[PDB]
Symmetry: C3
Subunit: 32 residues, 3 copies
Amino acid sequence: RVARLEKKVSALEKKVAXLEKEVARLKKLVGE
Amino acid sequence: RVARLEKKVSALEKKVAXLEKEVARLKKLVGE
Amino acid sequence: RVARLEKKVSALEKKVAXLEKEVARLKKLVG
Ligand SMILES: *C(=O)c1ccc(NC(C)=O)cc1
Ligand SMILES: *C(=O)c1ccc(NC(C)=O)cc1
Ligand SMILES: *C(=O)c1ccc(NC(C)=O)cc1
Ligand SMILES: *C(=O)c1ccc(NC(C)=O)cc1
């Protein structure tokens, strides 16, 4: 169970990094 | 401890799915 | 190993919170 969780967490980390970059680019495109 | 973590990771996987979908939609609307 | 996972999961939760806020703002401006 812990090994499987470790792999799920690593996958999530890669996706969240990404979303952060994508969100930062969209914020620039839309502007303020 | 591991069961509790599993629940948390499941909840995160759901939230990231979504964000991915929302971010794909916004990217299509902004273009580029 | 479990404590290392717990730290990683806490970190992700704070990051997803956020992304949700930022995305909610973007959705409102573009919608
Ligand atoms: C949990 O991810 C887990 C638990 C057991 C094993 N392997 C054994 C039982 O041979 C792998 C991973
Ligand atoms: C799409 O946003 C999407 C679709 C299915 C799920 N499933 C979870 C919430 O059980 C999440 C997000
Ligand atoms: C897991 O994150 C983990 C496992 C073992 C230890 N340390 C002790 C001494 O067993 C720390 C962290
Ligand atoms: C977002 O959910 C968030 C982050 C920081 C704060 N700080 C205030 C309330 O002290 C509120 C909400």
